[PDB]
Design a protein around this ligand. Structure first.
Ligand code: CA
Lengths: 246, 245
């Protein structure tokens, strides 16, 4: 049993749901999940700001559980900091654990997404997101700093975090179908930790004929690579079954 | 046996072609050949920089022709002036040019190799020496900050002529090192520029400062080795270049 530490916005309900679910289809490894929450309700530069300020407390709480990896699941709070903020966040967290002899590895949803995209050899990218436009635009800037080209994106503009957790798959699929994907390497069908997408990932891949992924499947990828386990997890798109194919 | 390295250099750049073979012919397990094409530039300003960069595609066909095993785009400041993550885009563009027309040569840029080498060292807190004008020096800093490094101090020698840069004494570079505070620093980038001479200074720097030092040239040397899947074991220049021994 591998203990995974989750740092999540208090109103987030989708990471604690999707991570266990797909990681339970792993061929030989078994996992357990352990959360600490940072208070946020409205996804705004101010909502993000007050949340992010709680990190120090959360890291301390979750390290008490001695997990093998900690996933800092606050994706948009990282990216609103702009170019390479996931490095300085992951670093800050590592530094903090180093103060107390924790052995935990660190990954973030922002890092993982970059990792999944690079694992795909993706250059041209499209994304679907529930954010307001100004925020959607920040996610896009951040990705372009990582070398990707955002050809097309969609922002459903749903600011209340609770409501984001309730976006139906059909709203998400429709936005995805409105996209021009002809010149696109990968579709990030959920660029948000909160917006559900899991039951969609595999089907979208089949329909669109290009790799599909989300913050969650990419988190699951990062996690698996960090614990040296086979990425051979079925039904969550090609990203997650790289070692079954090569 | 002999591994064909490609160099795409600024026309007035002199150091890359001196240092890259200097250190790389010090490998006990492989020998190398160097070959280049030139993008004209005389003034290291946003103007000349852009007009140099516009020459990339011609340069890259020219060198493909020789069929290098790796093509080093040899510009650092010319890459970093174009914004966070520019090296990815430039490498991608070159790479795509090559495949479009046969060549399988691997692609690396100094800017890239710099980060790769900082990262292989496990550096977070970095100090640096540059020849540049401050406005470009700050751009190089911003670029490295977006790559997740903390630039805790830097010197900027402020020498706009690329020829002046190359004629740059070890009196000056070594002096700047000693200038910077390094009591929190993990790695020295003793020269951020592929034009500014640094090498004789470098292996000593480490033994002097107790810390991993490097430069674009050495960092590009490291990156080349890794790309060619050769052991990194090159003398006289930092653990970075001798970390497999
Ligand atoms: Ca990067």
């Amino acid at each position: 049993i591998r203990r995974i530490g989750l740092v999540v916005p208090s109103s987030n309900v989708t990471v604690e749901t999707e991570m266990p679910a797909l990681l339970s289809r792993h061929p030989g490894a078994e996992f357990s999940f352990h959360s600490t929450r940072m208070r946020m309700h409205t996804v705004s530069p101010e909502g993000l700001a007050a949340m992010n300020a709680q990190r120090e407390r959360c890291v301390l709480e979750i390290a008490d559980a001695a997990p093998e990896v900690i996933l800092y699941a606050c994706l948009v709070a990282v990216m609103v900091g702009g170019p390479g903020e996931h490095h300085r966040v992951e670093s800050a967290v590592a530094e903090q654990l180093a103060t107390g002899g924790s052995q935990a590895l660190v990954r973030s949803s922002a890092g993982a997404l970059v990792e999944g995209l690079r694992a795909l050899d993706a250059q041209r990218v499209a994304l679907v997101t529930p954010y307001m436009r100004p925020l959607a635009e920040k996610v896009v800037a951040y990705l372009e700093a990582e070398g990707f080209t955002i050809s097309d994106w969609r922002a459903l503009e749903v600011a209340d975090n609770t409501e984001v957790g309730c976006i139906p798959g059909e709203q998400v699929m429709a936005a995805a179908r409105s996209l021009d994907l002809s010149e696109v390497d990968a579709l990030v069908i959920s660029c948000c930790v909160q917006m559900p997408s899991l039951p969609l990932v595999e089907t979208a891949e089949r329909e669109f004929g290009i790799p599909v992924l989300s913050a969650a499947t990419a988190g699951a990828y990062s996690i698996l690579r960090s614990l040296d386990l086979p990425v051979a997890v079925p039904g969550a798109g090609r990203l997650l079954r790289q070692d079954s194919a090569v």
